[PDB]
Each structure stands twice: as structure tokens, then as C-alpha cells.
Amino acid sequence: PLGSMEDFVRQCFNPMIVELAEKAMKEYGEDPKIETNKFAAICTHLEVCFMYSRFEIIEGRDRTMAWTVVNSICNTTGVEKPKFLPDLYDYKENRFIEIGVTRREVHTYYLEKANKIKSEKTHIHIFSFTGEEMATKADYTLDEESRARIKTRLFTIRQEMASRGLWDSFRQSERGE
Numbered sequence: 001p002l003g004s005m006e007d008f009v010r011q012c013f014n015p016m017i018v019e020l021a022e023k024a025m026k027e028y029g030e031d032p033k034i035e036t037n038k039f040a041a042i043c044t045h046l047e048v049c050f051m052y053s054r055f056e057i058i059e060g061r062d063r064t065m066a067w068t069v070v071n072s073i074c075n076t077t078g079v080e081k082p083k084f085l086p087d088l089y090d091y092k093e094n095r096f097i098e099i100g101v102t103r104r105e106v107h108t109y110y111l112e113k114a115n116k117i118k119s120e121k122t123h124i125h126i127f128s129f130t131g132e133e134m135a136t137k138a139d140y141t142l143d144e145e146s147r148a149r150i151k152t153r154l155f156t157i158r159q160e161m162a163s164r165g166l167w168d169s170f171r172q173s174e175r176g177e
């Protein structure tokens with residue numbers, strides 16, 4: 001059987017995650033009931049951001065609050081202000097971080113992200129549903145254990161999707177941003 005991705009999302013992500021992901025989609029004219037593969041990808045990326053985070057979370061916040069927090073950091077510190085909202089701030093390494101979760105080739109996604117943000121200061125850390133990862137300057141920020149826990153959660157999501165006949169389509173549907 002092929003299950004419903006909306007039903008999977010609502011049952012297999014934390015509701016706080018789901019709600020924030022709905023907001024994020026409603027904000028850009030996308031319907032979580034329609035673009036369900038995207039809805040799941042959005043929840044996944046949110047969960048990864050929250051797992052990864054020492055850190056200020058930017059992702060998930062209303063855009064007004066998110067920019068307020070970003071500007072607040074950029075002038076408590078003196079870090080260059082990003083052109084696009086990042087996902088986190090690392091107080092230890094004094095840098096913003098963009099987090100990616102991809103079902104495509106990690107190098108492909110990494111450079112897409114590098115080319116969009118055009119920043120020499122923002123760190124990029126990409127995770128795949130395969131266990132592969134790629135991070136700016138081969139600086140992985142977190143310890144082995146913390147990153148293996150992220151990759152393990154990605155395997156759980158994938159296998160749960162597979163269980164419901166959802167992985168095939170989900171894995172094939174990612175486009176460039």
C-alpha cells in the first residue's frame with residue numbers, strides 16, 4: 001500500500017515541529033496538504049536544526065523575530081550580517097550556520113547552498129539520508145556522537161517512510177531551490 005505523507009508527517013514528527021513547518025509553508029503560499037513531500041522535508045530540516053543545537057536557533061522563528069535575533073547578534077558581536085536568514089548561530093565559533101538535509105548528492109546540494117548565500121563567513125553543514133555529510137572547510141563543528149545521532153534519526157525517517165510506501169516518491173522529488 002501507498003500511505004498518505006500528510007498522515008505520516010502528523011504522526012511521526014513532534015507537533016511543535018509540524019506546526020512550525022506548516023507556518024513556514026503557509027507563509028510562502030504552499031499548502032502542506034498538497035506539497036506533502038516538501039512538508040516532510042521541511043519538518044526533517046527543522047528537526048535536524050533542533051538536534052544540532054552554544055547555539056542560537058534561527059530557523060523555525062517567525063521571520064520578524066528571526067531577523068530581530070540575527071541583527072541582535074550581529075551587533076552584540078560584530079559578525080557580518082547574512083543576506084539570507086541562516087539556521088543557527090554558534091556562540092563558540094562566533095558564526096552563523098546554514099543547515100541542509102538533502103535526498104540528492106551532498107556535494108551538489110552543498111555548492112547550491114554556497115552559491116546562494118555568497119558568504120565567506122557563514123558555515124554550511126549538509127546531511128543526507130544516506131549518512132553522507134559535508135561541512136565547510138572540513139570543520140564538522142559537532143563531535144562524532146552528536147552527528148551520528150542526527151544521521152540515525154535520518155535513517156529512522158527514511159525507514160518509516162519506506163514502511164508506508166512513501167520513500168520512493170519522497171527521495172525522487174527534491175528540486176534545486
Ligand SMILES: O=c1ccn([C@@H]2O[C@H](COP(=O)(O)O)[C@@H](O)[C@H]2O)c(=O)[nH]1
Binds near residue numbers: 041
Ligand atoms: O522553517 C523551516 C523552513 C524550511 N525548512 C527546511 O529547510 C529548507 C530550506 O531551508 P534552508 O535549508 O534554506 O534553511 C526549507 O525549505 C525546508 O526544506 C525548515 O525545516 N524549517
Ligand SMILES: [Mg+2]
Binds near residue numbers: 086087
Ligand atoms: Mg533556514
